[PDB]
Amino acid sequence: SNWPYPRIVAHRGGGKLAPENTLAAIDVGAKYGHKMIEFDAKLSKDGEIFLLHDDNLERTSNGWGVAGELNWQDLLRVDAGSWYSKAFKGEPLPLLSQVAERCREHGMMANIEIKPTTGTGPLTGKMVALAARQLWAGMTPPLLSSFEIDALEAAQQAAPELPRGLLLDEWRDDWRELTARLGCVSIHLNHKLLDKARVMQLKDAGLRILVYTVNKPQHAAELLRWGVDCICTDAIDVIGPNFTA
């Protein structure tokens, strides 16, 4: 299967240089020349698609409790920036429609990680998949990702054409049968789980491979030499869009 995605991917928009999953972070990503961003998507209670990694608002904002349990008109009141620096005072939870727009303006590719509120995978998978289809018309198709077989299955029905990747934070002996059934172009793995061998056999099974979250250049280089296709990094200043081994 064909593969337009860059070697390097900016984790949550701006890596650790800016407040994650934010419009401003995606800007920071473009300021270091990055060609592709990864970011985490969910549903509000009323079904707007916006970005937030966690189930709960606390870690990356001045809000509290389960984001998915609030209506968009209320998520609009949240500051998802000043937790990071005094400079990001404005910073709102961004809609997916807005992120698609930044991508177009900065000429960036997108890895949308479907990151549903616990219990909402199927609904979240379907909705994100159809919204991705609409908003990325005329553009590099976005790479849909998830830890939930839940959400990947729903994306496989709602938008078959959109390519898909399986996120694993831990190794699974059945990765071959699972990726095959899901119809994945890619497998997205925590970097600790790799070595020359697994890279080799993942490749032989026909899969593209992305890794996260790799910050040290020597280990980025190594992974690229083994055969990995994307390094998802937090250190967007040091790794950098034209990195090579």
Residues labelled as active-site residues: 11, 53
| CB-CB contact of 166 with 178 (8 Å) | yes
Residue 201 CA: distances (Å) to CA of 30, 197, 212, 227: 34, 6, 19, 11
Please give the Cα distance from 71 to 48 (Å, whole number): 8
Instruction: For residue 144, give the 3-state DSSP assignment.
Output: strand
Closest Cα partner for 40 from 79, 1, 73, 68? Answer: 68
| CB-CB contact of 102 with 29 (8 Å) | no
Tabulate helix, strand, coil % of the chain (nearest 5).
35, 20, 45
Q: Quick one: tokens of 90?
A: 């404005």
- What kind and span of H or E run contains 23? helix 23-31
Please give the Cα distance from 187 to 146 (Å, whole number): 10
At which residue do the structure tokens 């379907």 appear? 126
Angle between helices 96-105 and 121-135 (to 10 degrees): 40
Closest Cα partner for 26 from 8, 15, 241? Answer: 15
Instruction: For residue 203, give the 3-state DSSP assignment.
Output: helix
